[PDB]
Amino acid sequence: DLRPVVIDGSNVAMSHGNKEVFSCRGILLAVNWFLERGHTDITVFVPSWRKEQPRPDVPITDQHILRELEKKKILVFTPSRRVGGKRVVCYDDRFIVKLAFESDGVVVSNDTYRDLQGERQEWKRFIEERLLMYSFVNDKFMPPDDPLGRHGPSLDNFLRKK
Ligand code: NA
């Protein structure tokens, strides 16, 4: 009955704590929020370059959580590597949207992925109908009761299928 959930890990971790810090607990807390309500189909995407700490230009906290969530079959790392000198990063967003679109679930993020909706009609509509935004207050993960405005549906039904 519950929609599959797909979380933009980077969006969430940046929002949580200092906005200039990749706060891995942000991801834990969001995940737990869905767990507590009964969800079991949950996926969080984060680039794999977040795993390696030898010189992190955006700082990170509680890095170990990523691999923790990987083991529980919740977090999935996204691909990236260095070509010649520089880092190249297969885009997060694509995995996030493609998965949610094809699993017919929801996307948890405050990014609206303007690039992607400019690429494909079907993705634009999906994003409009299926983005779930949120605010954090310290460690409280707070999504809106009215995810699509007063005209759309309640949180509870947004997260169901029928
Ligand atoms: Na943050």
Residue numbers in the entry: 134 to 295
Text taken from the publication that reported this structure:
Regnase-1 (also known as Zc3h12a and MCPIP1) is an RNase whose expression level is stimulated by lipopolysaccharides and prevents autoimmune diseases by directly controlling the stability of mRNAs of inflammatory genes such as interleukin (IL)-6, IL-1β, IL-2, and IL-12p404567. Regnase-1 accelerates target mRNA degradation via their 3′-terminal untranslated region (3′UTR), and also degrades its own mRNA8. Regnase-1 is a member of Regnase family and is composed of a PilT N-terminus like (PIN) domain followed by a CCCH-type zinc–finger (ZF) domain, which are conserved among Regnase family members. Our findings suggest that Regnase-1 cleaves its target mRNA by an NTD-activated functional PIN dimer, while the ZF increases RNA affinity in the vicinity of the PIN dimer.
